[PDB]
């Protein structure tokens, strides 16, 4: 029943008169980056496992979904109930998997490439892994794990060859670097992992350690008067 | 009132469960789908994607509810009430949005550390750290029982090491892989064309044939 409050508040926020913000001037395009922002906040409240945070952040994600439904309903396309109607239909007719729902979504109705309908917005690691699995799905993939590792080693040698040259060709060095990164995604994938998520967790790990070394060096403290690699070591230990 | 219906469908529906993950990666994947549908102004796609997104909000609410954490309507209450309405430690790492691509974000973090004196002075140990991470990853991979959490941890760290290499070599990792993604996709598309021109299905060609085409395509560039 609170959902119904949300819906009318959302209605009343765009009520034209009255209205508003601001809200009134938001479109599908202007809400988009907030949805991106908000989804990572959701994923962060999850990683940190706090549910005070998470219940707030899901509220904000919902607010998003309700915002899109309203803007769609204002053009007569659909409303919130039709969104809930269609997922409910799909989940009923099908628990899960989530892969299943997604792949039969795709099954309509390209035509042409393996390869088509890949969001142009995707972070590079997400996009490489998606390209690779699309190609795997049609049978283009390595069959064993070892040549995958070996392709990483080959691309490292390639990168390092370019880097060693008397005159470094920067474009060619960037190209090899790119193929090395692609190869490492192929390995991540062959290992059962998601490359973009894996690096997100390594980023938080490193950031958490660095922040601690900062806290330690700072508490020291004073010093206008290494240091650093040894504290990094200790913080690494205390973990 | 299909809102009530979806909810009760959640109470009642891989089919293991999971958990806050493996849902969370799905929240990220679906969010890009939603933004793409908005970018391509396709409102039929959009309706479906919002259903997919909504379904995860409901799932999160269901797990939360099972744990006694006040649930789908509190979510609604929370945001409604809100809509009717002390320093952290200082850091060189501040203002790097969570939502940047992971590679771009690793490279940004490493530069902040470099600014402040925390970086390798020579290329040798950067290279070493990559080869060492590949040992640690592959070590976890071939263990009789694979610790999945540790494998992913080491896979992450290898990715972070390879960004450090990219950076010390004067390159931006996220852009470099985008351009590798485009090269790969170009060439696979040619292989798709060549096979279609024989009137075959890609799913009806053996891997050896695929590889020989792939090689012809790559020989057709130089």
Curated annotation (Swiss-Prot), chain A:
Cofactor(s) listed in the protein's UniProt record: Mg(2+)
Effect of residue 94 to A: Does not affect nucleotide pyrophosphohydrolysis activity
Residues annotated for ATP 2 binding in this entry: 205-209, 232
Effect the entry attributes to changing residue 151 to A: Does not affect nucleotide pyrophosphohydrolysis activity
Effect of residue 232 to A: Loss of pyrophosphohydrolysis activity against both ATP and dTTP
Binding locations of ATP 1: 151-155, 158, 172-175, 179
Positions annotated to bind Mg(2+): 155, 158, 176, 179
Record annotation: effect of changing residue 179 to A: Loss of pyrophosphohydrolysis activity against both ATP and dTTP
Activity regulation info: Inhibited by the MazE-MazF complex.
Source organism, top-level taxon: Bacteria
Subunit structure: Homodimer. Interacts with Era.
Biological role: Involved in the regulation of bacterial cell survival under conditions of nutritional stress. Regulates the type II MazE-MazF toxin-antitoxin (TA) system which mediates programmed cell death (PCD). This is achieved by lowering the cellular concentration of (p)ppGpp produced by RelA under amino acid starvation, thus protecting the cell from the toxicity of MazF. Reduction of (p)ppGpp can be achieved by direct degradation of (p)ppGpp or by degradation of NTPs, which are substrates for (p)ppGpp synthesis by RelA.
Name by which UniProt lists this protein: Nucleoside triphosphate pyrophosphohydrolase
Gene name as annotated: mazG
